[PDB]
Structure 1
Amino acid sequence: AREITDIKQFLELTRRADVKTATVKINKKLNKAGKPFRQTKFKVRGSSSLYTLVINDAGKAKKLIQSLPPTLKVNRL
């Protein structure tokens, strides 16, 4: 329901003491005129709202998964 764009505020949500699950969604989308790309969306299930972080860079998406806390439950696709 709410979209977050800052990377720093996304990491604190994963350890807000009220979050239990998260999901990773991969979408294959095209750019303005050329070849497609891989879009990754990180959704954090809060108590009252769902927070979604959308990044279009595949390289940065890999780093965020590694830094994701192990306690948080992650659903793939």
Structure 2
Amino acid sequence: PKQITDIRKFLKISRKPDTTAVIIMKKKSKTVITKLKLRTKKYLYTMVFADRKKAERIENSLLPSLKRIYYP
């Protein structure tokens, strides 16, 4: 696990063909927060989003060639 903050880095790592799966969580904090997680042979990269709008746009901006998983 290795948290990443910059968003262009994640948009770059999404296009990498060695990645297989993505993980989308939703949980109640106090509204809903999400942690976009991405699975790759090396590591598992997560990103926190306090903005539901940014979560909504980014989840669909992610390329469809990879599989999506939601634990709940």
TM-score (norm 1): 0.85
1:54 maps to 2:12: no
Q: What is the root-mean-square deviation in Å for CA atoms of aligned residues?
A: 1.0
1:63 corresponds, among 57, 62, 72, to 57
In terms of Rg, which structure is larger? Answer: 1
- Larger strand fraction of residues: 1
Gaps of 5+ in 2: none
Of all paired residues, the percent bearing the same amino acid is: 35
Residues 31-72 of structure 1 show CA distances to partners (whole Å, capped at 9, x for unaligned) of: xxxxx2210110010111110011111111100012110101
Query: Where does structure 1 lack aligned partners over 5 or more consecutive residues?
Result: 30-35
2:9 matched to 1:5? Answer: no
TM-score, L = length of structure 2: 0.90
Q: Tell me the residue number matched to 1:42.
A: 36
